[PDB]
């Protein structure tokens, strides 16, 4: 039984190709492999020639590239393609084991296609980075050939009565989907930019950023895989190991986040009085369409959250059920075709999905990060902008004494505006955080039924104990620091003088109250680090409290059958990925606070 | 420091920046030429290769549309005989564009599609054969070769004679064919600023050598003295002993230019002297001798120089005396 | 860097110090048989101490009161420092030569007896204990799945020499981003301090428009090292990320292949799997107190 | 207006009323080699597949009159084994000219004037195969496309260089291999009347650029500066910045031409520089470093140019001063 396309059964019947080779299941399944093998024919010459020949003397360095009409869409799609194709080779796979032969029509042509798939982003990148236009053609032919021939697969599945029931007549009829929605992209970029049929090759428009302006800062600029791993600060650290870093190698911001036209925009906003309430709409307006950006990604991947424990409890029930027994209980045309139900049973299935499940979750998580953070100092220099124009001219008639306040105009720029960028910084945060504990705790419910419902009130009722201590360490440094101002001012009286203040030799007794000055200090140091110890076995200490209060629970209380590892596994799972979004829920209160009596002092002392 | 071309006429530049890749791209040939031999080797194989992978999918697909691969029973003709897997359709592709024709595996007249292919695999086989080979003897007979073969001094001298100062240099030749229409030329590579304020970071100023009918021709096959004659307008009319150190920024650039004998082909032997490579008090030593009926040239004193005695004195002040 | 770490321990002495290695290093060990039961437990409940496993949670119940006890433990001892480091500076300062606070600008002993040992104070005690908790869990849970599969650790290995080289490149470059971030803070504030005095003497004669446009050559130094400081953090956690994801592949199709390969496990499987997906998670918390814990290390050099 | 050369180097010249085509049919071979690659396919693919067939007809109709179409009975030894139609013929004819040779049909030794076409067949098959694929490898190799890494200046300038106005441009090589026995020729092209009252409408003027040693020779590694000093006996000895707009007729032309080094072809680079594409008051920036122990061109800033200070009046007024 050597290697076959179409697998060695009865006598190699599946080869035959009688009643039509479009009614042959492998030919349809061959036929499939015809464009992936054009893609790889076509750019790998064009790549190398282009791209891989010249090196080592020859350095065409591109600093500036504008990107094609739907990139962003083109890159979705393919990362959705991708993963496609990684569950129809994961499907080809179970349905191949079954039978004694290997049938490679199952998997190979899937397995070619994602290899043509990576191809064509990789082609489009080069070719998107130095133009041409003209070489999409070799990816606009190829996606009508997958798309015409992923059709006819479809469209027998459909004559031979394969319902959606079969998970491969769900994953060809997304790969139809994909590949037409890939095949309007590429007809987007011929309409929009101009190129071969029309006889007005219209006007790239170069960007007005990114000529030699000295801008290093490239993530606004990259590419949307490189947007979420960031691999153009990769070559700019692989060298600031070997050099130390300046404002000068920093470069300069870009236009769009300068700070003048955070500030522009700010204050357009404010065309709508100037109090609070109407800070808070300018800011929604001017920094909104954005923010809402950083959640939804939060929000997607506090949903991937979930997909830990869940697969964590998919792959023990399947394992530890042993039996190892695996039956398709679905043939059509001698090949067996897995139901969705059935593909979900499998270990290996899990595991390669939630691997891929991770990477979406982890690179969404930094995505919210660096856009709320990128908001926020958008925010920053803005709002230090209006601060200096208050302070400056248009603020005619100053009311009384030495403008307000000296001491405080200080602080407000320095420790009163950063309250509110960290307030941007979490705002997602807050947003998110009841979003993934309302589903955290429904699905604790659905494993360990009332037991769960014990554990996740404490760690619920754990925040108000969270702000209560956070007050109390909060007081603790601000009556540190009414003795510590002491301490330091009683220190800096000859401190500084401690050059001529150590020739008069009176330092023997000046520092002699030094501890009495420090003890008065030490004091409260004692009272703020209580507190702080309590914070941490109230917070390091609650998850093992947790774990008991819902294990000990299923019999004290519950009395229900024995706990298999799965739903204990799953619900440990479950409250460590729960357990540490709730220091940032206490924090992101008292932040949320704090930035509340800010933007308060900003308004109040606006006028 | 840098040199702008090294002792074995490697060219120290490095382009950078530039943004015109579709030059590239609409010049292939050249570039295909241009590889290393590693990748040359790479790219000849790979096009066969995958020339006879293409196909071979072709041969197989029409085997299979045309009921070939299925066994069951006989009485039918296929497309190309005896074709069973893809490795059966992959070996007929081999005989077919490479032209052996085993004949185990034979093309029928059953199928139209397979006699067009047959055409098109021949046709496209051809012009990969004609483009791959050409190309791979152009690369092996390059005469960029040749000019490792064309030795020049490791030090250049600068002496009296005839009563004016000469910048002196010998190069040979190691092969016993000639180097046809061979041609010198000699630049010097510094950094020169106008009056105006222009700098020119790697100015070139070509310096004539003394032939006595012009210059920039030879008769090379015995190794010549080239020399230029420094005189009032020679821009080393100001070049002093002193200035004779390594960080001078002063780079004469000697350049033979021939048609090979032996293949046909223009070549180009490149040479660099800095300023410490050249020597002031000093002559190169005849290596020519009269053995039998032939001339013999001791190749092994090929550098030697013999100190002489020569004013310390700049080629400008000379002419002031 | 951290090489005249070494130093420091006077301060803790010896039986302080030891106490809190040995503390630290017991709660760890603890939560690792504690989880270590829990699947023995699970594995046994689907079937001797079978009878309802109170032996296992009366273990649970003592690591919490140790967890509990190692709390204030390596809190209380990092005030005593404190007070040592306090006592041995103020006998040192009045004993410091005249000449030579003369010869020296005198500032930085200022600074550093206040601002200094103000972070030593209320932080460094809290970010070390933050670090030990950190880096001993991942090695915890870089030897649970070791037990798990004895397999994984193959691989595990190159894998921690990728992160040493991520790691040996951000905390180069995050600190560097820190000195200039810390650099242009000082103008952007003192110009609005300038800004608050002689205003008048500003408004008055000048146009305020290059004084207003000056401060904008502050913000943008100031918000560039911000961003660029931020890139790097996201640019170490993605592929710490990717790291730690890489890692849970690996350990489960290992720990899976195993049950088929008629190696037993069973339900023991699932317990190494909870503890590779917080592998992730817990190595950017170990990175991110590493290079906190730089600025305690050069803490105590503005000391020694 | 129009541009007698293209800023790529394309002619902008047709030629009409030509009644002379007998010399066109006498030059046959170059006329192959200069289609375009549509037509150069289309020859190439033609000149075998009609070949193929010619002698296919041949082979099919000695078979027809042999009798061996005829399926009636055995016992006679056909002139080619196992040719049935016409099909058969046409797939013998491809075996023999392409030499694959299946076996399954072969010649056999009852005719001889099948013999006599199959030395034919061979010979014909020889000449065909020869010439075709010695034309389709001239026309890969062609020179001309490694004109396309041979950058020029998008725009001239006219500065003051030690004392005089100098015409300069830059010019520049891509590619790491160099350009053996590169000129440079310099023409202004406009209309100009004689004394006498005649006319040339694009009277092509050659002018000198500085060299040292006479002209028309570089060493084309790094981007060159290639200047013509304006001087009394120069076509640009009145021209003033005045006349440096757009309809002026006034036309330069810059040519370049060297042995490929890669190829060993002489290839040719032009660029013309329009009256409003060159600029007065401005002067190229040097682009030169020296990084490390190599230097580096950057071509980012290849044409750029920096105003400075430079007289508004022609090389005529200069001289009166
Ligand atoms: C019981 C079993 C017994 C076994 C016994 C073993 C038996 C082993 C069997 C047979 C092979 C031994 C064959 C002996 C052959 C000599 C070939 C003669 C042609 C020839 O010239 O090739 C030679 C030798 O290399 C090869 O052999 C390269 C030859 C081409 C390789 C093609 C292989 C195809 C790969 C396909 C495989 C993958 C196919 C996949 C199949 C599946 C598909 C479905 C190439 O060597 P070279 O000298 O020309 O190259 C050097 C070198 O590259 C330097 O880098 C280069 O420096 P630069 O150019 O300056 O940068 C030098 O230049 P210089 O002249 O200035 O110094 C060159 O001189
Ligand atoms: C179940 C079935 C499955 C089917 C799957 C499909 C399977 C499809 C199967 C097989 C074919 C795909 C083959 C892949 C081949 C690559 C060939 C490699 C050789 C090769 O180089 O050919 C390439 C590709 O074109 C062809 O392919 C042309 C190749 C020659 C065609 C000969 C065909 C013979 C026709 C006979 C038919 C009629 C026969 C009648 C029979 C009956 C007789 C009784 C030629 O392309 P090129 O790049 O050299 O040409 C361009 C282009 O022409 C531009 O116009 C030209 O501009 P200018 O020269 O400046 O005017 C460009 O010049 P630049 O360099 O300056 O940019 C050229 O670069
Ligand atoms: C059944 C499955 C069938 C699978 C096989 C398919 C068989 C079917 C076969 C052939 C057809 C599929 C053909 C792909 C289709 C359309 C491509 C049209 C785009 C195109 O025109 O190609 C060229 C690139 O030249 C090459 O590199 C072209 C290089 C050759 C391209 C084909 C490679 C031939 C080798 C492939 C075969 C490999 C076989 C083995 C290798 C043989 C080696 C002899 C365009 O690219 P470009 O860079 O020249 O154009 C740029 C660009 O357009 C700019 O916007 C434009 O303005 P500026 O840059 O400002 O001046 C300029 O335009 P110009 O080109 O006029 O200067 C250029 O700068
Ligand atoms: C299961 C998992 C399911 C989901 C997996 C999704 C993975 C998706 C990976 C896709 C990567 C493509 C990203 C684009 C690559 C690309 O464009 O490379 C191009 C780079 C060069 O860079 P540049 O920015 O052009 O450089 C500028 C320079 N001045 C220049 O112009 O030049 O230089 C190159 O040309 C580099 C080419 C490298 C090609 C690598 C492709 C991927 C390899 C396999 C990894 C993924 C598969 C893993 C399976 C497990
Ligand atoms: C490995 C996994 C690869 C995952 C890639 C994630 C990429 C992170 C997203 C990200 O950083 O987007 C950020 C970008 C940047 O916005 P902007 O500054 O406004 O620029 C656009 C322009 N100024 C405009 O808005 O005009 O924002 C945008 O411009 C829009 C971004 C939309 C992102 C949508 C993400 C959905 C991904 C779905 C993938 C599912 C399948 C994944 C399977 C493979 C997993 C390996
Ligand atoms: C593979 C590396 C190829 C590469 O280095 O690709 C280079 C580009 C950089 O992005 P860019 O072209 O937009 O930068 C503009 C340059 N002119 O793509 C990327 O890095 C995308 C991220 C690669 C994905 C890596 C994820 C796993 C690690
Ligand atoms: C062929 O195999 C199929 C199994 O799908 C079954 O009908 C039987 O075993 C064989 N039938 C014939 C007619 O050979
Ligand atoms: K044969
Ligand atoms: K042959
Ligand atoms: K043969
Ligand atoms: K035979």
């Known amino acids: ?607 | 420091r840098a040199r702008f071309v090294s002792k074995k006429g490697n060219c120290n530049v490095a382009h950078k920046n530039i943004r015109e890749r579709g030059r590239f791209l609409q010049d292939v040939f050249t570039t295909l030429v241009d590889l290393k031999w590693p990748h040359t080797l790479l790219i000849f194989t790979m096009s066969f290769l995958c020339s006879w992978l293409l196909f071979a999918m072709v041969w197989w697909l029409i085997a299979f549309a045309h009921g070939d691969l299925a066994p069951g029973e006989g009485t039918n003709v296929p497309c190309v005989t005896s074709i069973h897997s893809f490795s059966s359709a992959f070996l007929f592709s081999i005989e077919v564009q490479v032209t052996i024709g085993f004949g185990g595996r034979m093309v029928t007249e059953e199928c139209p599609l397979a006699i067009l292919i047959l055409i098109v695999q021949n046709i496209v086989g051809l012009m990969i054969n004609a483009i791959m080979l050409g190309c791979i003897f152009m690369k092996t007979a390059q005469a960029h070769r040749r000019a490792e073969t064309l030795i020049f001094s490791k030090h250049a001298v600068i002496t009296l004679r005839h009563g004016r100062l000469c910048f002196m240099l010998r190069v040979g030749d190691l092969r016993k064919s000639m180097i046809i229409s061979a041609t010198i030329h000699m630049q010097v590579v510094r950094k020169t600023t106008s009056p105006e304020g222009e700098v020119v970071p790697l100015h070139q100023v070509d310096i004539p050598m003394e032939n006595g009918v012009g210059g920039n021709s030879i008769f090379l096959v015995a190794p010549l003295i080239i020399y230029h004659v420094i005189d009032s307008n020679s821009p080393l009319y100001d070049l002093a002993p002193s200035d004779l150190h390594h960080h001078q920024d002063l780079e004469i650039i000697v350049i033979l230019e021939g048609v090979v004998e032996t293949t046909g082909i223009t070549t180009q032997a490149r040479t660099s002297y800095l300023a410490d490579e050249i020597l002031w008090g000093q002559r190169f030593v005849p290596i020519v001798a009269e053995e039998d009926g032939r001339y013999s040239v001791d190749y092994s004193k090929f550098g030697n120089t013999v100190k002489v005695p020569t004013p310390l004195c700049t080629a400008r002040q000379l002419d002031e005396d | 860097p951290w090489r005249a770490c070494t130093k420091y321990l006077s301060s803790a002495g010896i039986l302080l110090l030891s106490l809190l290695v040995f503390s630290q290093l017991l709660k760890h060990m603890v939560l690792v048989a504690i989880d270590y039961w829990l699947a023995k437990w699970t594995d046994s409940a689907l079937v001797d101490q079978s009878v309802y496993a109170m032996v296992f949670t009366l273990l649970c119940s003592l690591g919490i009161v140790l967890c509990l006890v190692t709390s204030v433990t390596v809190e209380w001892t990092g005030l005593k420092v404190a007070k040592r480091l306090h006592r041995s500076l103020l006998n040192r300062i009045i004993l410091a030569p005249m000449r030579f606070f003369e010869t020296t600008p005198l500032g930085s002993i200022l600074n550093r007896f206040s601002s200094d040992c103000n972070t030593i104070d209320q932080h460094i005690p809290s970010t070390l204990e933050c670090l030990s908790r950190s880096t001993l869990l991942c090695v915890s849970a870089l030897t649970v799945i070791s037990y798990v599969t004895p397999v994984f650790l193959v691989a595990l290995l190159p894998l921690a020499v990728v992160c040493y080289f991520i790691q040996k490149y951000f905390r180069v470059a995050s600190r560097d981003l820190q000195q200039l971030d810390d650099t242009t803070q000082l103008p952007l504030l003192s110009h609005f301090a300038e800004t608050v005095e002689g205003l008048t003497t500003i408004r008055a004669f000048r146009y305020e428009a290059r004084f207003q446009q000056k401060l904008l050559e502050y913000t943008d130094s100031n918000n560039i090292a911000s961003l660029f400081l931020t890139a790097a953090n996201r640019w170490l956690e993605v592929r710490m990320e990717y790291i730690g994801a890489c890692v849970v592949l690996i350990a489960a199709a290992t720990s899976i292949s195993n049950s088929l390969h008629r190696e037993l496990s069973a339900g023991l499987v699932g317990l190494g799997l909870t503890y590779a997906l917080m592998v992730s998670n817990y190595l950017n918390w170990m990175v991110r107190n590493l290079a906190d814990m730089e600025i305690q290390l050069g803490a105590v050099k503005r000391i020694h």
């Open chain 1, 1 to 607: 039984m050597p290697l076959a396309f179409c697998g060695t059964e009865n006598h190699s019947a599946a080869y035959r190709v009688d009643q039509g080779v479009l009614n042959n299941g492998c030919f349809v399944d061959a036929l499939n492999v015809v464009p992936h093998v054009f893609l790889l024919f076509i750019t790998f010459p064009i790549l190398f020639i282009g791209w891989g020949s010249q090196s080592s003397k020859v350095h065409i360095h591109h600093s500036t590239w504008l990107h094609f009409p739907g990139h962003n869409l083109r890159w979705i799609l393919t990362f959705i393609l991708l993963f496609v194709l990684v569950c129809e080779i994961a499907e080809g796979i179970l349905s191949d084991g079954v039978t004694e032969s290997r049938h490679l029509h199952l998997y190979m042509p899937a397995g070619m296609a994602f290899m043509a798939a990576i191809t064509s982003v990789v082609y489009y990148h080069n070719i998107e980075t130095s133009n041409f236009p003209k070489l999409l053609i070799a990816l606009l032919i190829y996606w009508t050939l997958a798309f015409i021939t992923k059709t006819i697969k479809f469209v027998k599945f459909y004559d031979h009565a394969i319902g959606f029931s079969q998970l491969r007549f769900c994953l060809t009829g997304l790969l139809v989907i994909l590949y037409g929605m890939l095949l309007l992209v590429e007809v987007n970029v011929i309409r929009v930019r101009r190129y071969i049929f029309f006889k007005t090759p219209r006007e790239v428009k170069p960007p007005e950023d990114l000529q030699d302006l000295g801008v290093r800062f490239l993530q606004p600029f990259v590419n949307l895989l490189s947007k979420g791993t960031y691999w153009w600060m990769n070559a700019f650290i692989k060298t600031a190991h070997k050099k130390p870093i300046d404002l000068r190698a920093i470069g300069k911001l870009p236009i769009a986040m300068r700070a003048l036209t955070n500030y522009q925009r700010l204050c357009v906003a404010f065309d709508a009085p100037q109090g609070a309430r109407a800070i808070w709409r300018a800011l929604c307006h001017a920094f909104g369409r954005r923010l809402i950006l950083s959640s939804t990604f939060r929000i997607l991947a506090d949903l991937l959250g979930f997909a830990g424990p869940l697969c964590i409890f998919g792959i023990v029930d399947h394992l530890g059920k042993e039996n190892h027994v695996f039956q398709p209980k679905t043939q059509f045309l001698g090949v067996y075709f897995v139901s969705s139900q059935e593909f979900l049973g499998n270990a290996y299935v899990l595991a390669v999905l939630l691997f891929l499940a991770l990477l979406l979750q982890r690179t969404f998580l930094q995505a919210s990060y660096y856009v709320a953070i990128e908001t926020g100092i958008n925010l920053r220099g803005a709002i230090q902008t209006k601060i200096y124009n208050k302070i400056m001219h248009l603020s005619t008639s100053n009311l009384s004494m030495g403008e307000m306040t000296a001491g405080q105009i200080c602080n407000l720029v320095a420790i009163d505006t950063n309250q509110l960028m960290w307030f941007f910084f979490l705002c997602p945060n807050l947003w998110a955080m009841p979003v993934q504990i309302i589903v955290g705790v429904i699905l604790l419910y659905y494993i360990l039924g009332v037991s769960a419902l014990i554990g996740a009130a404490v760690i619920i009722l754990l925040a108000p104990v969270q702000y209560f201590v956070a007050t109390k360490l909060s007081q603790a440094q601000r009556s540190t620091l009414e003795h510590s101002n002491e301490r330091l001012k009683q220190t800096n009286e000859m401190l500084r003088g401690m050059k001529l203040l150590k020739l008069y030799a009176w330092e023997s007794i000046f520092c002699s109250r030094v501890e009495v000055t420090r003890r008065k200090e030490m004091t409260s140091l004692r009272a703020f680090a209580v507190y702080t110890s309590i914070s941490i076995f109230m917070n390091t200490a609650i998850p093992i409290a947790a774990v008991l209060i819902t294990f000990v629970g299923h019999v004290s209380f519950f009395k229900e059958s024995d706990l298999s590892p799965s739903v204990a596994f799953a619900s440990l799972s479950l409250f460590h990925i729960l357990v540490t979004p709730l220091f940032l829920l206490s924090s992101v209160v008292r932040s949320t606070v704090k930035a509340l009596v800010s933007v308060k002092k900003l308004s109040e002392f606006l006028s």
